[PDB]
RNA sequence: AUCGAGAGGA
């Protein structure tokens, strides 16, 4: 129940080309996160907060 | 007498711990084995719920009341059900109880094992009593009722080997260890620096002797002086748990023996 | 699954009497292998375990919140004061024999897990069932008794076998397989057969 | 670089060499320049050697390159399997890609790859230019649900009337 | 939930002594360690079996009907 | 759901004896018992106590697989010897014994106090 | 796609696997439930009626019984309802669908299935209990684990599919795999780790212990082997007892480094029939190696022998461990007082290696290398030298482990575990990267805002200084989370990237299948070559084995080929040969021995001029040094009496075997020389092992055992050759396809991203690069 | 939390004093005086800060170890250091990087990281009392474990996670050891 | 049937226990005779096997069917000796000229005998036994 | 039973 309630969806993108958004990036510290997130479909896409 | 000999070191009602010198391995397991799972003794087996309007499920309380130990002095004059002739269960089979708890106060009734009333005809044979060691005099709790909370369940104990379900052990839990020292050498002590400043040395050290540096290794010695305790739940005494222990296992030997005769 | 991404079903069921056993007269509630270990370095499984021990004996929490000054070290300590070998080691007794195990065990505490998805929810068989109306195929899902799919992937293996006819076998006598008539002229599924 | 190389004696010896390690390639021109070995120059590149030294030297270099990242990762093929993936590259004269763009166009039969990527534009044009299909392909027996020429299906059978 | 009736492991009684339990912490102020100890039970296996028992009973009652 | 019930593994079911004899093939003077509804209790202690007798020459028993109770004892003996009797004889030891352990424990037992 | 490369069907099951020790390779544990709910129709013979009435007498609810009838007529009889289910006479052609029982073959696979050893056939053993439950040795070529994973099961419906089932797709069958001229399936885990330890020499087990491993193995003679100890006390040694299910005849060695048939180390391995002679046996002897006991026992003594070779050794192995025990504490990740002093020291030693260079690069006193940065020639040395750092820690740490820490142990089987896992559990983790470079300025200018801007030290780049049994800091944890997440994408990218390079591969070989000519053609006819492997044989038959014509020095050639009659200092002794007085001399011998020399240096000349870098050992049908030894064991071979050959049975011999090789058939100039080709490589390794000197010097062969050795040589070159039928087009596509997909991770471009230029073929690709010499 | 050099007596401190701590806990064991989250915020002492203005300020990891002023047991971790002198902020607590499903892993610092990715899916899937009226809720499934356990090994986190008083998942004994291949 | 095969006295060199703890490889010289050296393996957990000691090595045949416990105290025994094993010789290993050098394995258990004058004694045999005394 | 979407499992 709990880390439903705390889920974050990003979908995909555009037209130029790249930056790896399933990477977990250094600004996440204390907001994002580290482990948590689903493995394989979104796998990174999902966050929890 | 001639083989075997026991020695007492503590006794109380609830732990016999003893030697047990001049057998084999096998037989001093086959003693282990046999009072774990073999003896046999008397558990709720079958309960028939008329109301239950708790926050425990049926089910659940079923459960709870399968194991609530009950007094089986006299459990081998009590037939098994599967044997007896008649039909689903008799006095001559089984021990029949019932159950009856309703909210009363407004301080959450509580249901104990002391509430348990046996219904059936004994026979006056010390059977089915509900074992009580608490000292507030009521064993073991069996669910909790609000202000006007009603539970009614009719119990039927059966006679039962614990090799068929948990409840039917009478034992708990059953120490055993040979050779204090590891003078057979039948175990590869793991270490860091020293092996025996990091392995702490056993109550059983002190009835057997050193082994000394300077002796060679024994390799003629086999497993002989056995220390054992036999915890009880208290459905059976201890000293019967391994009377009877020793009892069962006499028995299913001889029963290989005699069906040699009729082969 | 214990509580380190370290999961695993049961194999087999042994009793207490067939079951290792401690001096003390300890059985466990649960045996997994040594094997699972080494290769995923799960190591707090091992300290839960060492910490949970001493929370068993000492009757107090164990603490494992992350960034503390907890170490292996301490907690041995602890428990060689209490008794038992600090590393978490117990001499244990083979159940079947009876006979001392060579080796000594890492016994102890552990918090484990029972996650969804059992066994009695997975098992599914069939044998001729349920068609779906547009294809004439058996239907997806176990909830109303359907058929796995034999996909191409599964194709291929037959093939690379050689085993020809059991790639038939299940792509007529099983699963479709219907019959039609052709005429002999234009090569289309035009006729009107008129049997019996 | 380290080599095996025959010395006077007979046995092999490791002989040391300066080999020169590049970044971009222009093969048409880097071998044609004095003082280099013009015999042993190789790319990574089997699309320039393609171009270059003929088909043949090609199907050796795709080989090579293909070989190469099977075996530096651990893992080992043997020989056929790899030449055989090659071979079937390169025997239709040019570089023929394991893609849609490549071998799904080799005038094979309609219903075969259809089983492959562009599913109906491959039956749209079949049914224009009036393809017909051999019915020889594994997929195109899958697809009719009969017996494939396959181990089993390669031979047929007949009974004999004695003996 | 309740107290478990007997340690998954070992066997023993455990469910007569929770009702104890809470006396010798509260009104005894002792510590878990000798409240255990006291209810004789000696080894974790049956230890674990009391400690680390959550009791949702109590709030389970909570509701009126 | 495919759990089968617990009593299968003391009580015999439809023309199940609880012996079984064997000559054994590869071995001259060989038997093999297959002990129906029992295990390690039993088999083990057999087995140990068909190896203090010197007139035997082989002596194992084994759970083919632990799912289902049975076990299987092979023995074999010197000629001249039955080896049914070399059980037979096993077993009244074991016997024996067991009923001086409950003889000298009850003796034991009446002279302690508490 | 959907519904026609792919259908859903009947008579299929499915449920979650669990493993079984106390079962046979070959078998399949299927659950009685499902049993009970799949079936097989089964036409009514005289043969059956008897054992079939039985059954339908027993109906749809106990075990080994029937569901449906089938009459003449086709009119279905369903007996789970119906008036006359406890009546039914079968008349002879009736049809009587009966549930499954023991020993039916049933083909069970495990997905995605990028094989054909993902889908094999097995014998059903019925039981009690949920799940599949399969051989713990036949995990590997399936990729199953009991984690949680679910298996497929199909029935097959005809006695032809039965058959076209239980002779191809069966497991025995499928032992030694094609893809990679080796068995695939080995000894895991337990019994891996299990037999390392028996097999030491200080482990004895004595009487009662040993004469129930005797009785555990079913294939036991009845006949106590004699003990290596008879002294005071008579003690079997491990190696005793592990032999008895090893069969006679079976021949190996290997020397592994410090070998000196005295094994001071316990190294390598000598198994002389059947008996094991020494060495501790690991994943090297009895894992699913290239020259190990699984690929011999398997063309020696045959697939079914082998199938049940995998039994015996478990049956014994996880006995002894039962009563052995073994266990892993965190004690076994406790390293030394000094050790873990000195691993500090060594981190702290590159520590202020790396600040150095950084100062050295700071005062622009940085060389730069040719063709580099110099931003990036101090990247590569930070990196470089951090690397070193945690591997002479580990190293350091992997010294110090006692030879009883059971780490340390599987490690040495071979079961599980490996060196980097060491240094990270007890020395410490290491550098953590994203994306090749070590963690990157995320925030402007620094990598956390707990670190000032312009930091390019250690910590702040994310060397985790840290073990796992200490414990890793706030920031270090982080930087592991980031180097964490990025394998975790791949194992969720890649995996489908390469699912799609296997539909790739496998759509575009499918057709490619060898006739009956050993053209390798596909559905229009056209060739894809003209020998298939360019040799004619199959893969699976086909192993390693050296070539002793390339190597070694021109006058070490000499002193092992040539045979002078015309010289006394190189004649061949009399002792050798019977008519070895009379030969010396001669004439028209010695035309046919320079006619043999003159051979053996052709090819000498020639091996050289195909394999330039010198290399000896390349896969070849037929291991000869196996059937020499074969040879010289069989018929008793004592080394001291004269062979009673004629150098003209050799020489002239050898040549008649080369004749009647036969890869192809045809009687005609073109086919001829195909035929002569298509050898070439194979003879070249004829000659070499039977050449005149060596068949009576070296290996002293008999006159009759002689001729033996041909006749095999012939027989099993024969049974060598690919069978037309076979699809080598999805045989290579899957051979290629699923290593590929086992891929998961200098400057160029390697693994799967590779490939997928490769097969695409592509014009703009990443790492062009010539290398000129 | 908030440093800022107030300090007449010494070097740059945290802007919180024990006596804050201190009327916090007042709160807490009244359950008069009235201090919470907010009169933190409100005198100044606690301040929100988003990502992008993290790009401008300088953080400590720990109060104590990050800024007291300038032997070692071994089996302690290898920390850094100081190194830093202008520290604007420091932080709350570093375990708080976590969400709520990877507080439930007790040591995850002493373990590798995708694997405690996998326990905080499994976590999910875990099964106990998911709220004190189950009976009451008519749900499409809801499983409830018998007999609860609020583990030996806690987090802190666990604390506010509530699971202390609604655990999934029992304590086993546990053996790791090759028994019967089984 | 039944002979000795060889017989000799020998003296302990050089004793090591190669990371075991039940088993020691053993150098030992051999007295009178100069051109002879021994190397086995030897359990010293039953019969400890200390440097500078002298003992007496014999090999015999003899005093094929299943092995039989005892009884055997009730039956004539070539053993008048301590320590016994049986073994396999597997090769037979020539040093230059005329000197030879025989092995065998006791199940596992080496040994490495060099000499001459036992040329037509140790054939190239299943059998083989091993006894050493005092 | 048909479509579309989401969550998980290996
Ligand atoms: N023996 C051996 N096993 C390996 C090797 N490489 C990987 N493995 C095993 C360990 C892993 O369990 C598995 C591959 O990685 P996984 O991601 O499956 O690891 P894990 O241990 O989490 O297993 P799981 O994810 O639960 O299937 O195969 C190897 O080189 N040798
Ligand atoms: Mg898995
Ligand atoms: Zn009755
Ligand atoms: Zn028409
Ligand atoms: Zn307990």
Known sequence: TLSHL???????????????????????????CPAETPEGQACGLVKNL | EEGPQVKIREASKDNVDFILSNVDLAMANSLRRVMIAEIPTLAIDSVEVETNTTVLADEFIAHRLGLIPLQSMDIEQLEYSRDCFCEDHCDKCSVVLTLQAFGESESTTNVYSKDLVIVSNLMGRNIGH???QDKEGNGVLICKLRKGQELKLTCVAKKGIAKEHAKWGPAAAIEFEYDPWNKLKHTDYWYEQDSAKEWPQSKNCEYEDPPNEGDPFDYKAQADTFYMNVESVGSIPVDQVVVRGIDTLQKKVASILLALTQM | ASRHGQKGTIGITYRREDMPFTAEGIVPDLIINPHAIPSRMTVAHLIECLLSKVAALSGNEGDASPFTDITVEGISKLLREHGYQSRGFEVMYNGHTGKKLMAQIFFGPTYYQRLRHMVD????????????????????????????????????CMIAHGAASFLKERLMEASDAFRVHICGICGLMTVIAKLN | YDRKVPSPTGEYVKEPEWVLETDGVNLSEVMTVPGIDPTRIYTNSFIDIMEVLGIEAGRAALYKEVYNVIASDGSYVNYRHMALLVDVMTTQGGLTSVTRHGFNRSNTGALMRCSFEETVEILFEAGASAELDDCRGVSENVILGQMAPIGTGAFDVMIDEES | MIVPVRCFSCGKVVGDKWESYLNLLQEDELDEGTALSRLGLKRYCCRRMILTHVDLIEKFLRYNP | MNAPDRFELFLLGEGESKLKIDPDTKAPNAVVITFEKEDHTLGNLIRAELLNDRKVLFAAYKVEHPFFARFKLRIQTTEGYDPKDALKNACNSIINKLGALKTNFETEWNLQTL | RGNLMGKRVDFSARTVISGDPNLELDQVGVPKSIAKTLTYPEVVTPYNIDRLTQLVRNGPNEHPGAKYVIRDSGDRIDLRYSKRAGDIQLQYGWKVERHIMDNDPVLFNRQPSLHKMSMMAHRVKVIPYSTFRLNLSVTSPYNADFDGDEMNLHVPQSEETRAELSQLCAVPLQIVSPQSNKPCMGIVQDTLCGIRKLTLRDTFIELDQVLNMLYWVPDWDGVIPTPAIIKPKPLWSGKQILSVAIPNGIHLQRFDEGTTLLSPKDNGM?????????GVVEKKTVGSSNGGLIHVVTREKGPQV?????????????????????????????????TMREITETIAEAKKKVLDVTKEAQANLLTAKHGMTLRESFEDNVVRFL????????????VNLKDLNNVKQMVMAGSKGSFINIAQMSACVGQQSVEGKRIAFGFVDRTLPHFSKDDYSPESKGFVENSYLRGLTPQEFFFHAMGGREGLIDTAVKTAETGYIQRRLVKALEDIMVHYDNTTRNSLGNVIQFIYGEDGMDAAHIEKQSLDTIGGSDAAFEKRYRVDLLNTDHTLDPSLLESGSEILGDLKLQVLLDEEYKQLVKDRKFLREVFVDGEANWPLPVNIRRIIQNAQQTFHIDHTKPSDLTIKDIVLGVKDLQENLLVLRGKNEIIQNAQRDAVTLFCCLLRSRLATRRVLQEYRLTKQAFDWVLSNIEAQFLRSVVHPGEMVGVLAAQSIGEPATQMTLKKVTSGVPRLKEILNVAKNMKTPSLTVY | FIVEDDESLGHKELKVRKGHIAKLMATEYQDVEEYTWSSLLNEGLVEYIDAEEEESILIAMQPEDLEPAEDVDPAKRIRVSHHATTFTHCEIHPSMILGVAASIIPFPDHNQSPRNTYQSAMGKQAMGVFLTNYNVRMDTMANILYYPQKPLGTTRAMEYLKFRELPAGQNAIVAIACYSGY | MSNTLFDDIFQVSEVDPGRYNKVCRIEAASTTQDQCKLTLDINVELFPVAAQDSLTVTIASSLTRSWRPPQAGDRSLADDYDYVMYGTAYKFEEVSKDLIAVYYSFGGLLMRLEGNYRNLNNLKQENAYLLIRR
């Open chain 7, 387 to 398: 690397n070193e750092a945690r591997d002479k820690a580990g190293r350091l740490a992997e």
């Open chain 2, 130 to 132: 509900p074992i009580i």
């Open chain 1, 6 to 32: 705390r889920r974050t969806n990003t979908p995909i993108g555009r037209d130029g080309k790249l930056a790896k958004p399933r990477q977990l990036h250094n600004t996440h510290w204390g907001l994002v």
């Open chain 7, 270 to 278: 000598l198994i002389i029939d059947g008996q094991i002679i020494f």
């Open chain 7, 306 to 338: 082998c199938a049940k070779l995998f039994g015996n050794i478990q049956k014994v192995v996880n006995f002894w461990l039962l009563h052995n025990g073994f266990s892993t504490g965190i004690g076994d990740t406790i390293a030394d007082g000094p």
């Open chain 3, 121 to 156: 929810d997975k098992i599914h068989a069939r044998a001729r069932g349920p068609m779906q109306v547009l294809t004439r195929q058996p239907v997806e899902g176990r909830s109303r008794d359907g058929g796995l799919r034999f996909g191409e992937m599964e194709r291929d």
